[PDB]
From Swiss-Prot, chain B:
Coiled coil: none
Top-level division of the source organism's lineage: Bacteria
Protein name: Small ribosomal subunit protein bS21
InterPro entries: Ribosomal_bS21 (IPR001911), Ribosomal_bS21_CS (IPR018278), Ribosomal_bS21_sf (IPR038380)
GO CC annotation terms, alphabetical: cytoplasm; cytosol; cytosolic small ribosomal subunit
Ranges annotated as biased composition (Basic and acidic residues): 57-65
GO molecular function, one term: structural constituent of ribosome
HAMAP family linked to this entry: Ribosomal_bS21
Record's compositionally biased regions (Basic residues): 43-56
Taxonomic path: Bacteria, Pseudomonadati, Pseudomonadota, Gammaproteobacteria, Enterobacterales
Swiss-Prot record, chain D:
Annotated protein name in UniProt: Ribosome modulation factor
Function per UniProt: During stationary phase, converts 70S ribosomes to an immature dimeric form (90S ribosomes) which are converted to inactive 100S ribosomes (a process called ribosomal hibernation) by the hibernation promoting factor HPF. Inactivates ribosomes by covering the peptidyl transferase (PTase) center of the 23S rRNA and the entrance of peptide exit tunnel. However crystallization with T.thermophilus 70S ribosomes shows it binds near the 3'-end of the 16S rRNA near the anti-Shine-Dalgarno sequence, where it would sterically hinder translation initiation.
Compartment list: Cytoplasm
Additional facts recorded: When cells are transferred to rich nutritious culture medium, RMF is quickly released from 100S ribosomes, which dissociate into 70S ribosomes. It indicates that this interconversion is a major system regulating translation activity during the transition of growth phases.
Family: Belongs to the ribosome modulation factor family.
Curated annotation (Swiss-Prot), chain E:
Oligomer and partners: Part of the 30S ribosomal subunit. Forms a tight heterodimer with protein bS6.
HAMAP family, per the entry: Ribosomal_bS18
BP GO terms, sorted: cytoplasmic translation; translation
Name of the protein described by the UniProt record: Small ribosomal subunit protein bS18
Cellular component aspect of the GO annotation: cytoplasm; cytosol; cytosolic small ribosomal subunit
Segment forming the signal sequence: none
Keyword Ribosomal protein: yes
SUPFAM superfamilies recorded: Ribosomal protein S18 (SSF46911)
Molecular function in Gene Ontology: mRNA 5'-UTR binding; small ribosomal subunit rRNA binding; structural constituent of ribosome
Sequence similarity: Belongs to the bacterial ribosomal protein bS18 family.
NCBIfam families per record: S18
Species annotation: Escherichia coli (strain K12)
Gene name, Swiss-Prot/TrEMBL: rpsR
From Swiss-Prot, chain F:
UniProt record, GO biological process: cytoplasmic translation; negative regulation of cytoplasmic translation; positive regulation of cytoplasmic translation; ribosomal small subunit assembly; translation
Assembly notes: Part of the 30S ribosomal subunit; the largest protein subunit, it is loosely associated and not always found in ribosomal crystal structures. Does not bind rRNA. Probably requires ribosomal protein uS2 to associate with the 30S subunit. Binds in the junction of the head, platform and main body of the 30S subunit; the N-terminus penetrates the 30S subunit while the C-terminus faces ribosomal protein uS2. Nascent polypeptide chains cross-link this protein in situ. Can be cross-linked to mRNA in the ribosome.
Keyword Cell wall biogenesis/degradation: no
Gene deletion effect: Essential, it cannot be deleted. Upon depletion cell growth and total protein synthesis become linear.
GO molecular function: mRNA binding; RNA binding; single-stranded RNA binding; structural constituent of ribosome
Positions contributing to RNA binding: R137, R140
Keywords: Acetylation, Chaperone, Cytoplasm, Phosphoprotein, Repeat, Repressor, Ribonucleoprotein, Ribosomal protein, RNA-binding
Gene: rpsA
Phenotype when changing R137 to A/K: Loss of RNAylation by T4 ADP-ribosyltransferase ModB
GO cellular component terms attached to this protein's record: cytoplasm; cytosolic small ribosomal subunit; membrane
Protein name: Small ribosomal subunit protein bS1
Length: 116, 65, 100, 55, 65, 351
RNA sequence: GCUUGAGUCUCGUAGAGGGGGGUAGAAUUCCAGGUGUAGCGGUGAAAUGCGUAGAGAUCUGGAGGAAUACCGGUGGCGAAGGCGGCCCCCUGGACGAAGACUGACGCUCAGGUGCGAAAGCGUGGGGAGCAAACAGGAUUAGAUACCCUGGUAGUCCACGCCGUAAACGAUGUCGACUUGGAGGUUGUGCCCUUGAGGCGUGGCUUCCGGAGCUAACGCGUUAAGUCGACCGCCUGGGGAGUA
C-alpha cells in the first residue's frame, strides 16, 4: 500500500480491448483494470465506454495507494484512448503530462497479411 | 505525443498531433506488407492529384448558378 | 591525398587521457607524411540519446589529410579501445576549418 | 401527403455525415449551392472525428 | 516558399544543428520539402546531414529515448 | 512604320507595372461596379468598396483618375488588381517621409490594443501597432477622452510584415518568417490581416510578412457548420484575427476569428444574466419540448415545456403560445460552459 | 583527303548503379528477474488457443535475426531484371562548359555468348517476424476455401543450378525531320547577384493537347505523324505452345 504520491498511468489501447495499468514513477504496477473485465464482452469491449468504465474501476482500487497526480502514457490506436483520459480528469487526478508510446518501427519485422 | 503545459491544456493539441501522425502510420503498418501496392496506390493517388488539379482548373469556367 | 573528417566520441570519465589520445593519433598520422587541418575538441556535451546507459560524452573533431592505410590502421585503433565509443571517418574533398 | 423534411439544409448535413463515415474521403460528392455544400462538408468533417473515435 | 540553402551559397554540413533543428520536427522526423520548400539537392544533402548527426547523437531519432 | 515600333517603346516608357500612374478614367459607374481604363488590355471590374471614403458614400464620378495595380495578367478575361492597395504605397511614402522627415505628423487616434499596441488609423485606413507605440511614456490613453486627437509619433514598425505602432499625445516629446516565429506567438495576439482566398473550408487571412493563416470554418462566427465563409465575411478585407496556434514544423499558423461576437454572447449571459432579468423576445421554431425564443443577437436555445403556464406536462407549446411572437420571457439561468441559457415563461401573474 | 557521324583527353556535376566490409536506432520474438492479478487474445459474431503452474500489462538487463519510419518526391540511377539507414574500400555508366586530338573508326545483327524478379533445386550455415503444406476452431446444405488460433519448407547468407513472368510502354534498335502549353529534375552562359531577378542554352523525365495517323480507343517532337537501315515475329478458333 506503500503511500505513494505520484503515478504513471499506462493505457494500452488496442482495437479489441483497452487495459489501463496505473503504476508509479518507478515502473512497477500498482493496479490495472481492463475494458473486458468491466462486464463488457466481445464486440462491446471495443467501445470507448468500456474504456471509461475501465479507467473508473482502476482509479478506484488505486485509492489505497493515495495518488494525487499521475502522468498518462497511451499505447495503441484504439477506440478508447481519449474517453479513458477524460475519465482520469474526472476521476480526481492531476495530469502532469501526456505522452505517446505507440511503437512505430523504422520498418523492421514484416506485418501479417490479414484480410480478404 | 508530449503535452505538459499550464492549466488550460491537455486535450486539443494532443489529439491533433497524436491523432494525425499516430493514426496515419499505425493504421498503415498494422498489416499488409504488399511490396507492390504502395507503387499502385501512390500511382493512383498522384494521378488523381493531377487530375483533380487540372479538373478543378478547367472546371473554373462556369456552372450556370 | 585522401581527406578525412574524423569525429570520434569519448567515454566521459576517461576524458583526461584525451590530450594524450590526440597526441598519439596525430603523431601516428604525422609519422607518415600526412598533414592535418583541424583539431577542434568540443568538450563534454550532452548526448541526444543514451549510448550504453550513459549520457554526456566528450567529442573530438580531427579532419585530417592522410593516406588510406594509415587511416585504416587508425580506424582499427578506434575499434580496439574501450575508451572510444562511436568513432566516425568521413569523406574526401578539400578539408576545412572552424565549424560550430 | 405533405411537404419535404428539413428542406435539404439539415438533410444536406446528414448526407455529408453518412458519406463522411462510410469512407468517401473525396469530399467531392456534395451539392453545389452554398447553403447546402457548406454543411455537407460540415457533416463530412463532423464525421471524420466520429471515424477516429471508432474503427 | 523560399529555400534558405539556396539563399545562402551553402553545401549542407552536418554539424550546424542550429540550422538542422529547424528541419527536424519535435518528434525527430525530417520535415518535407513541400513544407520547408527547399530545393531537392539541398533536401538530399539535408537528409544525409540529419541522419549523420543522428549517428553522432547530435540529434535524436525519436522522442522516446 | 518604325513609327509603330517607336510608338510601342514610347508607350512602354509612359506606363509602369504597379499602381503608380494615375491613369484609368472612370468610364462607367453602376452599383456595385466601377470600371476604368489605364491603358491596359481590358477594363477593370472594380468594386465600389475600394472607392468610398470613410463614411460609406462614393467620391468619384466620370473622368476621375486613380491608379490600380498590376503584375497579374488574365484570369480568363479582365485586367487588374485593385487601386485601393495603390493607396498603401502612398501611405508608405508618407510614413517614409516621417521616417524620412525624421518624423511624420498627421493625426493618430489610438483607443486600444488588439495585440499589445494601440490601433492607429490614418485617413481611411486603420493600422495596428505594438503596445509601446501608442504612448510615449506610461500615460495610457484609457483615461484620455475616447478616440482622442493627437497625431502618431512612430514607436515601432516591423519593416516586412506591416505593423506600425504610433505615439499619441505628448506633443512636446520629439528562412525569413520562420526562424524567429515568436513575435505574434504567445497565446492570442490579435492581428489585422487582409483575407486572400476562401477555399470553402477556409478564408486564408495572411499578412505578417510572408506567412499563411487559415481561420478555417469552425470559428468565423458563432454558428458552426452551415456558415459558408464567403457569405459571412468578405473577399480581400482586413479583419480582427489573432494566432491561437503556431506550429513550428508543418508551418501552419492556425488563426481564429470567433474572438469577437463571443463577447456579445457572454454579455447576453451577463448583461441580462445578472439574476432574473425579463426579456421581450420572439420565438422562431417550437420543437415539442419548448418554443425557442432567439432575440438579442444570436443567443441560442431557450424556454423548456416545463414552465409555460402553471401546468406541467400536458401543454404542447404550439397550442399555448404562438409562432413568431414577442413574449415575457425572463432568464432564470445562464450556463457559461456548453452555451445554454434557459429562459422561462411561468413568471407571470396567474398564481 | 575533310569533319558534321563516331571516339579520346583536361575540369567538374548529380545519382536507392554494382561488389566487398563495418556500424546505428526504433520495433517484433524469446530468456532471466521485479511489481501485480483475473483475465488475455480474436471476430461480422464466436470458438479453438494462452492464463491462478501467475498470463495480458509495466519496468530493468541480455541474446538473435531481419527490414531500414521520417526524408520520399507520376523524384533518381541502371541495357533489362532491379536498386532506399549511415560510413569506408574497389569499381561501371551518364551529363554539361571551353578547347585540343583521331579521321567514317558507323548502324543493325541470324547463329553464339553474357545478364536475367519471384518460386524452386543442390551443398553448408542461419532462423526474429511472416508464412505454402499441415493441425484445430468457425462459416456453410457441404467448405479439402476466404475468417481466426497455431505452425514446417521457404523467405536470409555463401557457393552452383534453373532461365521462366501481365519479364508490359502489352510499343525491337539506330538516325533524320515535323505547330504548342504546364510542370519535375539536373548542368551551364550573359546581364542591374544589385531581390528566391530577367533572357537563353544542353540532358533525362511527367501530363494535356495541335496537324497528321488509327477500325476506334487513343498516340501526338520521348509518335502509334513523314521517312531510311537492319533484325525478330504473324497468317481463322479449338487440338496446342500439346504430342
Amino acid at each position: 500500500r506503500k503511500q505513494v504520491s505520484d503515478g504513471v498511468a499506462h493505457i494500452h489501447a488496442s482495437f479489441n480491448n483497452t487495459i489501463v495499468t496505473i503504476t508509479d514513477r518507478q515502473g512497477n504496477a500498482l493496479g490495472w483494470a481492463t475494458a473486458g473485465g468491466s462486464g463488457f464482452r466481445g464486440s462491446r469491449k471495443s467501445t470507448p465506454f468500456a474504456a471509461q468504465v475501465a479507467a473508473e474501476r482502476c482509479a478506484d482500487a488505486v485509492k489505497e495507494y493515495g495518488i494525487k497526480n499521475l502522468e498518462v502514457m497511451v499505447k495503441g490506436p484504439g477506440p478508447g484512448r481519449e474517453s479513458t483520459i477524460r475519465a482520469l480528469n474526472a476521476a480526481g487526478f492531476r495530469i502532469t503530462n501526456i505522452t505517446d508510446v505507440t511503437p512505430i518501427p523504422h520498418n523492421g519485422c514484416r506485418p501479417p497479411k490479414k484480410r480478404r | 505525443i508530449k503535452v505538459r503545459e499550464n492549466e488550460p491544456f491537455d486535450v486539443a493539441l494532443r489529439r491533433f498531433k497524436r491523432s494525425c501522425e499516430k493514426a496515419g502510420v499505425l493504421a498503415e503498418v498494422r498489416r499488409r506488407e504488399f511490396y507492390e501496392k504502395p507503387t499502385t496506390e501512390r500511382k493512383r493517388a498522384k494521378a488523381s492529384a493531377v487530375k483533380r488539379h487540372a479538373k478543378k482548373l478547367a472546371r473554373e469556367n462556369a456552372r450556370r448558378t | 591525398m585522401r581527406h578525412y573528417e574524423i569525429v570520434f566520441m569519448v567515454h566521459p570519465d576517461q576524458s583526461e587521457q584525451v590530450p594524450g589520445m590526440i597526441e598519439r593519433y596525430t603523431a601516428a598520422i604525422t609519422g607518415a607524411e600526412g598533414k592535418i587541418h583541424r583539431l577542434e575538441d568540443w568538450g563534454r556535451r550532452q548526448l541526444a540519446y543514451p549510448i550504453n546507459k550513459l549520457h554526456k560524452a566528450h567529442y573530438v573533431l580531427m579532419n585530417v589529410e592522410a593516406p588510406q592505410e594509415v587511416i585504416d590502421e587508425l580506424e582499427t585503433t578506434f575499434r580496439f579501445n574501450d575508451a572510444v565509443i562511436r568513432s566516425m571517418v568521413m569523406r574526401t574533398k578539400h578539408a576545412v576549418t572552424e565549424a560550430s | 401527403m405533405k411537404r419535404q423534411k428539413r428542406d435539404r439544409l439539415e438533410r444536406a448535413h446528414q448526407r455529408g455525415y453518412q458519406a463522411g463515415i462510410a469512407g468517401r474521403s473525396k469530399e467531392m460528392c456534395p451539392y453545389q449551392t452554398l447553403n447546402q455544400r457548406s454543411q455537407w462538408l460540415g457533416g463530412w468533417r463532423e464525421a471524420m472525428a466520429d471515424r477516429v473515435v471508432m474503427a | 516558399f523560399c529555400r534558405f540553402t539556396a539563399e545562402g551559397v551553402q553545401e549542407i554540413d552536418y554539424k550546424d544543428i542550429a540550422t538542422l533543428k529547424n528541419y527536424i520536427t519535435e518528434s525527430g522526423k525530417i520535415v518535407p520539402s513541400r513544407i520547408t520548400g527547399t530545393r531537392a539537392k539541398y533536401q538530399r544533402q539535408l537528409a544525409r546531414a540529419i541522419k549523420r548527426a543522428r549517428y553522432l547523437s547530435l540529434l535524436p531519432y525519436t522522442d522516446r529515448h | 512604320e518604325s513609327f509603330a515600333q517607336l510608338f510601342e517603346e514610347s508607350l512602354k516608357e509612359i506606363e509602369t507595372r504597379p499602381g503608380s500612374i494615375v491613369r484609368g478614367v472612370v468610364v462607367a459607374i453602376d452599383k456595385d461596379v466601377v470600371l476604368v481604363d489605364a491603358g491596359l488590355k481590358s477594363e477593370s471590374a472594380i468594386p465600389a468598396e475600394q472607392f468610398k471614403n470613410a463614411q460609406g458614400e462614393l467620391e468619384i464620378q466620370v473622368g476621375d483618375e486613380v491608379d490600380v495595380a498590376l503584375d497579374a495578367v488574365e484570369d480568363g478575361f479582365g485586367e487588374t488588381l485593385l487601386s485601393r492597395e495603390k493607396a498603401k504605397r502612398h501611405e508608405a511614402w508618407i510614413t517614409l517621409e516621417k521616417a524620412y522627415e525624421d518624423a511624420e505628423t498627421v493625426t493618430g487616434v489610438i483607443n486600444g490594443k488588439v495585440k499589445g499596441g494601440f490601433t492607429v488609423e490614418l485617413n481611411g485606413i486603420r493600422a495596428f501597432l505594438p503596445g509601446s507605440l501608442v504612448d510615449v511614456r506610461p500615460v495610457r490613453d484609457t483615461l484620455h477622452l475616447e478616440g482622442k486627437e493627437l497625431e502618431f509619433k512612430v514607436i515601432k514598425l516591423d519593416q516586412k510584415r506591416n505593423n506600425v505602432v504610433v505615439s499619441r499625445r505628448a506633443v512636446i516629446e520629439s528562412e525569413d518568417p520562420w526562424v524567429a516565429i515568436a513575435k505574434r506567438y504567445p497565446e492570442g495576439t490579435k492581428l489585422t490581416g487582409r483575407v486572400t482566398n476562401l477555399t470553402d473550408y477556409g478564408c486564408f487571412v495572411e499578412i505578417e510578412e510572408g506567412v499563411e493563416g487559415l481561420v478555417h470554418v469552425s470559428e468565423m462566427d458563432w454558428t458552426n457548420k452551415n456558415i459558408h465563409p464567403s457569405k459571412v465575411v468578405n473577399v480581400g478585407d482586413v479583419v480582427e484575427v489573432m494566432v491561437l496556434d503556431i506550429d513550428e514544423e508543418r508551418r501552419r499558423i492556425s488563426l481564429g476569428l470567433k474572438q469577437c461576437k463571443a463577447n456579445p454572447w457572454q454579455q447576453f449571459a451577463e448583461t441580462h444574466n445578472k439574476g432574473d432579468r425579463v426579456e421581450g423576445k420572439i420565438k422562431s421554431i417550437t420543437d415539442f419540448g419548448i418554443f425557442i425564443g432567439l432575440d438579442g443577437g444570436i443567443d441560442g436555445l431557450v424556454h423548456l415545456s416545463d414552465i409555460s403556464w402553471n401546468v406541467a406536462g400536458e401543454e404542447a407549446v404550439r397550442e399555448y403560445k404562438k409562432g413568431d411572437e414577442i413574449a415575457a420571457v425572463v432568464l432564470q439561468v445562464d450556463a457559461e460552459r456548453e452555451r445554454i441559457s434557459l429562459g422561462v415563461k411561468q413568471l407571470a401573474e396567474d398564481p
